[model samples]
Target: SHMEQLKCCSGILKEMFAKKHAAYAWPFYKPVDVEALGLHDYCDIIKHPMDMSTIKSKLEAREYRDAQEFGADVRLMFSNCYKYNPPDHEVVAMARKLQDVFEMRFAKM
Candidate 1:
């Protein structure tokens, strides 16, 4: 028999203060470009303070309060995705990774 450790979301991220681990755990879904995923809805629902979905412009699934709130570096990068074409599948999978990354960054912040 093995002893069951008290493993859980709280245990995994010991230092997390304001962020929720569940927020970091987006369920698997059909591939979609994460860059296209918008953050405005969440903010509207009182989840986050800002949107960080601009990965090279071509804001597919994106929305924002205004042009003034975009993250400078990311906004610059997003502003440039229009000239290139990546398959939708690639974008979806990338979106999942980016979602996790955003969750982690906010958690650590």
Candidate 2:
């Protein structure tokens, strides 16, 4: 199980973070930028929640192609993300949890 999990996670790390290694440092990641996978709309939504009433583009509910939640909700996770008290999986834990998630999802996609 560990081997299976570790191999899967290793693959996922490469698929997700490796691709964006150049772009994501402390602040941002340069996404694929394609119509199907671009992340700008999400960025816009985060920046302008009031104006973002209807979804302008198709969005995957909870499925991320990669460990793509870096800027999505890091601050909230760190502090204010509960159902009125959300617990944020720390970046360190995320680094590990997401490694697993990335591998699992990458294989599926």
Candidate 3:
């Protein structure tokens, strides 16, 4: 049943990237542009960077063991945002909103 669960969880991830959450999710769609953004210390601060694209690719590649591992990566994305940006930053706020939507959907599984 684990494979079935993985499929379900993968679908949930795809839904999060859909138009419904696009406003809050756009900034996190791809990997952060450290050089272009001039974030010289980004890599030092974020050892485990994550993004929606990376997660989706990992899912497609079957790198995730299960939904729990997938969830961890999702949380890690938000965690990195929270750590790198100021508490009041817009990106941090968006991350919180998206994270709530993710958890609400993820909980049902």
Candidate 4:
């Protein structure tokens, strides 16, 4: 039963990562490269960094117990973006839209 539940949650994450609003998802597809971006204070501002690739790996590793936990990580990714970027920044806007889309789909799960 737990295996089936994990499978279902994994499917949801995979679907969201692969096909939904790719444009909005682009910035979040991988971990933020602070050094490359010359954001030396990024790690200080955002303690718990999250990204789609990490989420996907966690899912594949069977780290999430259910869809709710998976959703939490997705929320964390967007939340991190909001914390690091200005309110009116383009990335923040993208994060807002993507987060809303995630919430809509997650609610149905």
Candidate 5:
């Protein structure tokens, strides 16, 4: 369980980004209030250009306990993004595409 957390840090980061940009006015127009979920580790992934291999290793390491936990983390990450930004269909589409790529790669591992 602990090992998976370290390994999936990268995955969590990607998940957060993927979740944040894919929604239309997600965090902003949720039509309700959301509790803040701490994401300092996950947010750090944006500090620089990350290598694909590194991301894979971090995520595929069995870090996640289940899909729901990862999904929650993703929602939290996206929450801050949708505050006032307009939804972009093209951007959301691309983000989904990227999510698919991550899923495929993670599956292979």
Candidate 6:
């Protein structure tokens, strides 16, 4: 299901970063300013837990290729997040709701 999974990330690359080309260099993807792109909150949250400096730089400079690779690397680091440590039910519920809302909103545009 990498294709389906690919679809999800593609939107972030395509729409969010405005990389309209089918074949893209992840390093060339330039996202809007973190605050402007609605990633400010997530960046803040992540900063406390880990170093996202490299990714943030790539994202800021619109380096799609580099950023994508960095993202994937970070993705693996958190792949089993919360599997060993349980989070509060209410927090997960809120996150799920928020995720749905954002995904739907993103899809609409």
Best by lDDT: 3
Best by TM-score: 3
Q: What is the TM-score of each candidate against the true structure?
A: 0.23, 0.24, 0.95, 0.86, 0.28, 0.29
Candidate 2 ranges with C-alpha deviation above 4 Å: 20-109
In model 6, the runs with Cα more than 4 Å from the true position are: 1-58, 65-88
Better of 4 and 6 by lDDT: 4
Q: What is the lDDT of residue 78 in candidate 4?
A: 90
Provide the clashing-pair count of each candidate structure. 9, 3, 0, 0, 4, 11
Which ranges of candidate 4 are over 4 A from the true structure? 1-5
The TM-score of candidate 4 is 0.86
Using lDDT as the yardstick, the better of models 2 and 6 is 6
lDDT of 3 by residue, 2-109 (tens): 798789878888888999999999989999998875579999899999999999999999998888988999999999999998899889989998999898988988
lDDT of 6 by residue, 12-46 (tens): 43443333331322322332244655445544444
Candidate 3 versus the native: TM-score? Answer: 0.95
Query: Model 5, 1-109: lDDT tens per residue?
Result: 5455445555544553455544532322222222355433433433322333333443566544655444444444343233222467443544455555545544543
Could you tell me how far off, in angstroms, the CA of residue 5 lies in candidate 2 after the best superposition? 1.5
The lDDT for every candidate, in the order shown, is: 0.31, 0.33, 0.90, 0.81, 0.42, 0.39
As a whole number from 0 to 100, the lDDT of residue 2 in candidate 3 is 70
Identify the superior model by TM-score, candidate 2 or candidate 6. Answer: 6
- Across residues 1-109, which tens digit of lDDT does each residue of candidate 1 receive? 0111112222322322224433432221121234455633432333222123222131233332322222343323222221232446443444454445545643443
Error of 3 at 90 (Å): 0.4
RMSD after Cα superposition, model 5: 11.7
Q: lDDT value for candidate 2?
A: 0.33
Model 2: per-residue lDDT, tens digit, 1-109? 4435444434533444454532332121222222555434544434322101111111224222323332233223222212211245343443344335444575473
